[PDB]
Each structure stands twice: as C-alpha cells, then as structure tokens.
C-alpha cells in the first residue's frame, strides 16, 4: 500500500569529554537502510539494507558529505540551545531531528514533515502546509523568527515535495522484494494458570511486516482495553516484527474471551477463540 522515507538524527552533548555524539539513520517504512555514527572509525555513511548497496560512489560520497553537514549543524544547535535556555556547560543535552515524506498507494506525495526536539520535548515543527511553523515554547519562537526571515520553509518544501519523493520511489523500485511486501502475522493464543483460580491469556502475532498492527481482547464482545497488557511491537531481527497482548482472567471464563488481530497482510481481520 502506502509508503514513507524518514531520516532520524540524534545529537548528544558530552561536556568535557570531546565533541557531541551524532547518530543518523534512514528508514523506508520500517526497514533501515543507512547509518552514520560520529564515534565510528569509518567516518562514512554506511549501507544497512542489501538494496542500497548497489548505489554508486557518488551517492556514498555525497550522502557522507551531507550527513557531516547535518552533524555540524547540530553541534552549533547544542550551544545555541544552551544559550536560549540559560543552561550550564556542565550537563548533557539532546537535540533530535526527524524529516521525511509519505506517498500513497500510487506513489504520489501525500505529506511532508520536518520536526525538532530538545531534551525529549517538541521544540519546532513544520506544519502540514509546509509554509509555517509550530514553536512549542518562547525559545523555539526565537528560532521561528530566524527561520521565517531566512525562508527555511520554502527550501524544505522543495526538498520534501521533490527530492524526498524522488529517492523514495527509486528505493521502492530497487528494493521491491524487501519494501513492497507484506508478511501477514502468524497468530496464536497461549494459556497459563497463575494460580488455581486465574489464567493468563496471551495473544501472539509473529513474523509480520510492516510493523503497524492492532491486537485487542474482547470479553463477550466488549473491549477489555484497561485490563490488557500490550507490549511494544518489537523486531525479530530478520526484517519482521512481533507483538503480544495479555489479560489475566478467572479460570472457567476463557470462552468469553476473544483476541482480535488487524494487519494489512490479512485478507480479513482474525478473531481467535478458546472454543
């Protein structure tokens, strides 16, 4: 179906222990394809998917050049942010940046995004029109004034509507086997006594791709959302994902309880039962 390309950047200051740690990764949907780490020896943007390996030396040289330019930008940001917030030289702080584009089923531009965080909280974000900014506090207002005066939004919009979508389509084509696939979850439920009066029912979804999934428990058709323990969707390590949902029920009531699985790989949503 639909697709996304996203770059993620994390810079962490390390005061009196050298320069900040910078890590960049790029994803198409839930498949990583590149990385850069400022502490690594290579000092190169590196391949992390088989279908990006075919990119020639101009790609590798230019992507390394650009990622190093992003790293320098964040080095400056960390100093500026400490000034904006009247913070001391002492403590470690974190800047995060994410940008990228979505396309539909037909691979045409759906939407673009470009967002910053400082110390885990929204700082400034490009709005959906790609023409204006949401600044989360007074310090991010200062950035907004500067980014408006410099016409930063216009430069981002041209990238997100053009280059971003251009490279996404290219990746979807070259890595079609990996990227344009759907692996439906293999589903089952497990049952284990916790005492002589209660049992854990755990609904499992395995070996699925993409990561987006919904798992829910119903009792006599009623959602059991506050009684459900739902783990974060986790990577198997082979390019697929896993998730579970559990409820603890009275022994004897198992047949009231059903697990409900939705995933784009399923021809229909599944209902799993204890009878």
């Amino acid at each position: 179906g639909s697709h996304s390309m996203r770059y993620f950047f994390t810079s962490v200051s390390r005061p009196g222990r050298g320069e900040p740690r910078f890590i960049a990764v790029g994803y198409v949907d839930d498949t990583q394809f590149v990385r850069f780490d400022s502490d690594a020896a290579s000092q190169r943007m590196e391949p992390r998917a088989p279908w990006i390996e075919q990119e020639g030396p101009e790609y590798w040289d230019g992507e390394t050049r650009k990622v190093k330019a992003h790293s320098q930008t964040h080095r400056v940001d960390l100093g500026t942010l400490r000034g904006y917030y009247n913070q001391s030289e002492a403590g470690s702080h974190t800047v995060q940046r994410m940008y990228g584009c979505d396309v539909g089923s037909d691979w045409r531009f759906l939407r673009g995004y470009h967002q910053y965080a400082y110390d885990g909280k929204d700082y400034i974000a490009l709005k959906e029109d790609l023409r204006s900014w949401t600044a989360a506090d007074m310090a991010a207002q200062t950035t907004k004034h500067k980014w408006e005066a410099a016409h930063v939004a216009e430069q981002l919009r041209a990238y997100l509507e053009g280059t971003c979508v251009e490279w996404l389509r290219r990746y979807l084509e070259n890595g079609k086997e990996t990227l344009q696939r759907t692996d439906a979850p293999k589903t089952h439920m497990t049952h284990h006594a916790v005492s002589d009066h209660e049992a854990t029912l755990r609904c499992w979804a395995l070996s699925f791709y993409p990561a987006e999934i919904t798992l829910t428990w119903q009792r006599d058709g009623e959602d059991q959302t506050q009684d459900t323990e739902l783990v974060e969707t986790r990577p198997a390590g082979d390019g697929t994902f896993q998730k579970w949902a559990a409820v603890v029920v009275p022994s004897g009531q198992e047949q009231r309880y059903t697990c409900h699985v939705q995933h784009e790989g399923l021809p229909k949503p599944l209902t799993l039962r204890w009878e």
Partner: peptide, 7 residues
C-alpha cells in the same frame, strides 16, 4: 537523498 540550517 538527505537534504542546500541552525536553530
């Protein structure tokens, strides 16, 4: 493949 910025 990456984007031509400081806060």
């Amino acid at each position: 493949x990456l984007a031509x910025l400081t806060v």
